[PDB]
Amino acid sequence: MSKFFIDRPIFAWVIALVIMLAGGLSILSLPVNQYPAIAPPAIAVQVSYPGASAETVQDTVVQVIEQQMNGIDNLRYISSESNSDGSMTITVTFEQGTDPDIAQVQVQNKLQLATPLLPQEVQRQGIRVTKAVKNFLMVVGVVSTDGSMTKEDLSNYIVSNIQDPLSRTKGVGDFQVFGSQYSMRIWLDPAKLNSYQLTPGDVSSAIQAQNVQISSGQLGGLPAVKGQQLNATIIGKTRLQTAEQFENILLKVNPDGSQVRLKDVADVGLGGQDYSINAQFNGSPASGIAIKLATGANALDTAKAIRQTIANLEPFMPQGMKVVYPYDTTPVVSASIHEVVKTLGEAILLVFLVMYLFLQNFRATLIPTIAVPVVLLGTFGVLAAFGFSINTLTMFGMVLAIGLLVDDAIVVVENVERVMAEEGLSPREAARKSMGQIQGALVGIAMVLSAVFLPMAFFGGSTGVIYRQFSITIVSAMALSVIVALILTPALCATMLKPIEKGDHGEHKGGFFGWFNRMFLSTTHGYERGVASILKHRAPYLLIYVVIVAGMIWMFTRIPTAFLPDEDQGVLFAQVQTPPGSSAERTQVVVDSMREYLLEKESSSVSSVFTVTGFNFAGRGQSSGMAFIMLKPWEERPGGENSVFELAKRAQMHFFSFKDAMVFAFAPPSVLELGNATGFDLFLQDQAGVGHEVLLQARNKFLMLAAQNPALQRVRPNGMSDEPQYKLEIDDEKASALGVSLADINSTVSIAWGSSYVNDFIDRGRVKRVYLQGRPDARMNPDDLSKWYVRNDKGEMVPFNAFATGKWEYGSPKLERYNGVPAMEILGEPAPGLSSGDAMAAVEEIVKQLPKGVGYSWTGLSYEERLSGSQAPALYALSLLVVFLCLAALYESWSIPFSVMLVVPLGVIGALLATSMRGLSNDVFFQVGLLTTIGLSAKNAILIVEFAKELHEQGKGIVEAAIEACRMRLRPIVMTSLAFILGVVPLAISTGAGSGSQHAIGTGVIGGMVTATVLAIFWVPLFYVAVSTL
Amino acid sequence: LMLAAQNPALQRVRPNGMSDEPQYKLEIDDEKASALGVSLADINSTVSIAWGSSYVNDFIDRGRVKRVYLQGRPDARMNPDDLSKWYVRNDKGEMVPFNAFATGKWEYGSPKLERYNGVPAMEILGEPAPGLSSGDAMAAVEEIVKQLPKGVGYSWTGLSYEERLSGSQAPALYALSLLVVFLCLAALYESWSIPFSVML
Amino acid sequence: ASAETVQDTVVQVIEQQMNGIDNLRYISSESNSDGSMTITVTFEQGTDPDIAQVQVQNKLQLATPLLPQEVQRQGIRVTKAVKNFLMVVGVVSTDGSMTK
Amino acid sequence: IWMFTRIPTAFLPDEDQGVLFAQVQTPPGSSAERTQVVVDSMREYLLEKE
Amino acid sequence: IAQVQVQNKLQLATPLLPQEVQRQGIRVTKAVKNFLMVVGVVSTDGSMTK
Amino acid sequence: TAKAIRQTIANLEPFMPQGMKVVYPYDTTPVVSASIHEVVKTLGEAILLV
């Protein structure tokens, strides 16, 4: 090629056009969204078993569902959660890359098989199966600002009015509502009910016989008798709708002339299905929605569209209802795109400038201007092909690639320009001449660079998914670049470039350029003299290399090594845990003081506060609420005392005071989707059936033994504390003595105290649920237990205290199980300075001290990093061997390839330095850039050596070749490295919105860039002469 | 449908939901059945067992499992008056007639409500009047449909949609196929003129 | 149940769930006075029939708890939806020994 | 260009497919016999006259 | 898919099976016809029975 | 999946009562290891022989 396309500029141009086109069509219809699916996909099975112990929900629904939940493809592990409010969750975690639609359907199939094994009330409730990934698009609040509506009223609104339209909005995936539909609430008074010798169970039965659908037949149904003529359906009665219809319904008819109905005995009105979770946006009571993006949608379009839909409904809303949008991914997925077309612009601009500055031509200036965008276009096409998307990482992927993309354009032009000046060949001549020298190398370097980036795409787990994003977007960019810098560029060169006088390096020029050329020219000679001196005096340097190498080896183990960069998304979390036995109303108070403060004392940074009671990241329960703090946009809170990490630093202090409610306060970890990216994560498991008590003390020994270990820090239980519960105790003897029914005993507790889902009732079309339970003042203290009367043999009401006998005993409000056997989740991290594998190696040991029958499993990120980590060395070796082999075949030598590979440290040292200096971590963004810098460094090196080789061959000294090759190479090296480090600086200084990551790459590259330029120029000729000599 | 038997281009226009139908609105005063003896709407075990079928259980029959079915005599569910004939047994043991709690208020609603894209709907069909094409017919319909009480739109479905869609591609089909041809000639002939000579 | 009861207690719920499935072209349900209903979810021309079926089934399972207990303890049918019949294969009686 | 816009626009050509449908719908309420008679006339004024 | 389709029609059967069977726990499985292996457990000093 | 069960009972063994050993009565996998090993071997021979 090249030669072939040098003569066929139009064909060449066509190939451009088609890839340009493919780019475009693609570019405009790629899904756009913030992150791909990093997390290992998970399905969640969940019901509530209205007012039931953790114990019952664990041994009655979890243990049974779990026993059936096997023979499911791609399953990695499974964990459960049985809670005090009576809710449960089985979380089934499958392998990355698992079709989430098959994952889900296999799970709800095993679920379906296990249903008739569950208790009635649970079945009637209906068990929900869904995809548990937390990649939320926006969460929208619906709030009652005059505090007229209760939460329950709002969420019923949401279900009835907002749900179905929002459902039909373009690009809306799965969403969750903060609460549900209304239910016909009914509130049994124990006294009012006792005075007519009536049981709560009587009421249930009454409603069941009195709130039904009359099934209805057909007038003139087939078979009919001869005649018939009129065939019409007969419609009977539907069901009760009004609260009144309910207050009616006859319960007893009295000995005299009268009749008793539900309205005498209980209160009745529409209400909550469940009262466990209460939540409010800035004090004001509120529900809301958490929306997911549908698969392939556009995060930008559909956010705009969700809004549209809601706006079209804001005209119709009851007075004092506001729909505020607290959290929204749009600012960031926008920020990321501007911050790319901006640096792709500044880059093509910057290239143009240094193009001119060195090559005084104007036509030359725009060969790179055509080629770079022809490539970026294509790249979005290849991305399309491989089935990726436009997201945070595929975007940085492009920025990071621009180095490689730009260098490829510069080398090709500067070389024709050079050959033309030094040899006086016509542009067309210089082009083929030039490609003669370059094709070879180029093709080869594409191989080299594929080996540098691909093995990273073979990692597994979340870590791997992230690398694949970079690796593929990059080697795609580079592969395309090579192609167009083989087909288009030389063609453009031969066409658009203008002949230049042999010998004319232009210092006669005068003016500024005359100043420059004379100047640069002198520098070049200096550089030559530099090299020439080094090649004279070898050993000294070779050893100063060996120092710089050690410096790098030392600089590694000394950098803090984290998974991701710390990010300021617009968000902050606050956890509240009021001590065991607190009431939500007593927890609510903490979460309110919390909000007042943030909103008042802190509003320099804080924009809105959403506050939940009876739910947490430690579990659900009346002692548990928390706060999702929404910050105002980064522009509106400059200065590093208004960063999340700062606001959160001081909200610790502000709340440290409380001697009545532990209150953690922390930032979310950058990729929400992945929960908790730090330290380590494990479950302790009761294998040999040893029991909750032993297990509980294995947890506690483990903990107060890690606390006193060098290698670990911050080691907690994720779960919940054990607490007092009320061990109500029946007596079979003295209860059949009063001749009381015993099925009647505990059927009354279930209903009065636990509540009971009795029935359906069409409310405004929608069928909704009818719940029966004791009025609240009737069920708050042991003494209220006595308020309750059951029927015996004769019509005599027997009080509960008659055969009852309460007792404080303590159990658990959160029963955890991991892989079928009961568990306790521990979290922690390694002692500052130390690493994850160290901490596991510690934990590995302190686990051995545990009671027999208790074992353990690693889970979440700790599970993954055990696997991905065992595979690194294999990849690094393959990467190293393969590049080696490519260099061998290019250099027709087993030894020269070393003179290129030894540049690597020279790259990395600077990288490490800058990163460590600016106080940053050894993370994924640093890792990937480090591969960019060493990659672009190998390129430089490859061309120098290749030239030195071509010359040495065309007949001249090893040392004379090395020097003649540098010099020849110096100018494009300087050009492309000046172009880039300038193009990257913004990321280095980047400010707000993704800026944390931009710092991670800006700092890294340009550490390596600076050193790899100012050093390979000297040491590459050393190494080449060095190994050649040898 | 009026305007459609009138319009000269259409031919055979029809609906798909079969109108409204007479439905026998039943009625009970819960209080009166409680006054007699039959308390609680237990009455269903009579209304639906007699006037609808009632799959009770299974019997094998020549080695194959069919259903056992309960339903009233044909002559006992033919007229509003046949409901008179049905005596609910009592809590004492006596036959309360069905006239103690009746009220057949011969009413009427819909036999088949259709629905399309989350709004309610009616589906009309119809061909085009001979010598004309579905496009003509289609264009015609988009007129007769303006005279529709605002707040009532329409949607094409089926063949119509498939045709609406077929027609919209065409522009681009031609553009693209034109363009490819151009470039391939360019490539193959190393000319711009030659391509232009052929587009012309 | 009444056509309108049926339209409002089932069709309404499940239909809203199907909103949002991938490559969805349109939905068209119908409810009858005889109890029966039918939602027909049409997809775009390249959608794999079996993933579409599964996706339907996945959403369907979510609607379930908001359905009448007669409906719910009953079992909802889901199936691929051909418009046309390939052939009617019939049987008739040479003499007259077998009734309809 | 003038000639284009002047041509009518179909989808698929009509085809003597070799089969046809009759579709009967007696007014909202009729008995089995009502429909059945209608259905039995058109089955004659077709199998006998066409 | 085979399994998704079978269970799906198995589904429409379930409401008509006897409680005693439903409660018993039905297994829909996609295995290969033959036994791969038997994992055995055996008592060493006889403390454990069959 | 042989390897993987070998692996599950592998780290369940440390929890079994003192009077109990896991054993592999029936097993099919020995034949495939054996089979492909035997071929490997007659390949290595063929190559020395050739």
Ligand SMILES: CC(C)(C)c1csc(NC(=O)c2ccn3c(=O)c(/C=C/c4nnn[nH]4)c(N4CCC[C@@H](OC(=O)NCC[N+](C)(C)CC(=O)[O-])C4)nc3c2)n1
């Ligand atoms: C972290 C992120 C994504 C950046 C963010 C920032 S702000 C925000 N959203 C919230 O701040 C917020 C604010 C209020 N919430 C709530 O009030 C509830 C409580 C909801 C509730 N109340 N009664 N029932 N449910 C809730 N769930 C706390 C409970 C566990 C989670 O799952 C769901 O609640 N899913 C909804 C499905 N329901 C409950 C409807 C199932 C059903 O049909 O019964 C979320 N989550 C929230 C979440 N998320």
Ligand SMILES: CCCCCCCCCCCCO[C@@H]1O[C@H](CO)[C@@H](O[C@H]2O[C@H](CO)[C@@H](O)[C@H](O)[C@H]2O)[C@H](O)[C@H]1O
């Ligand atoms: C499964 C397939 C995997 C393939 C992986 C192999 C990667 C190969 C990398 C591309 C190398 C091409 O290398 C090609 O051949 C020889 C090197 O031997 C070189 O040709 C050379 O010959 C002469 C004299 O020998 C020199 O003046 C000069 O160095 C160069 O012109 C060119 O630099 C190049 O055209």
Ligand SMILES: CCCCCCCCCCCCO[C@@H]1O[C@H](CO)[C@@H](O[C@H]2O[C@H](CO)[C@@H](O)[C@H](O)[C@H]2O)[C@H](O)[C@H]1O
């Ligand atoms: C011209 C283009 C050339 C560039 C392309 C080069 C691609 C790089 C190849 C690496 C891909 C191979 O995939 C990788 O294989 C190795 C070796 O079996 C695996 O490694 C596995 O076996 C080795 C050897 O027993 C173990 O030390 C290792 O811990 C284990 O995981 C990796 O887990 C897998 O990810």
Ligand SMILES: CCCCCCCCCCCCO[C@@H]1O[C@H](CO)[C@@H](O[C@H]2O[C@H](CO)[C@@H](O)[C@H](O)[C@H]2O)[C@H](O)[C@H]1O
């Ligand atoms: C024109 C430009 C072309 C550029 C495009 C190049 C595409 C190359 C992408 C290769 C994708 C590799 O796919 C990835 O393989 C790795 C490693 O084997 C898998 O990881 C898995 O493999 C090995 C098995 O030996 C295990 O050690 C590891 O724990 C496991 O999870 C990933 O789950 C899979 O997704």
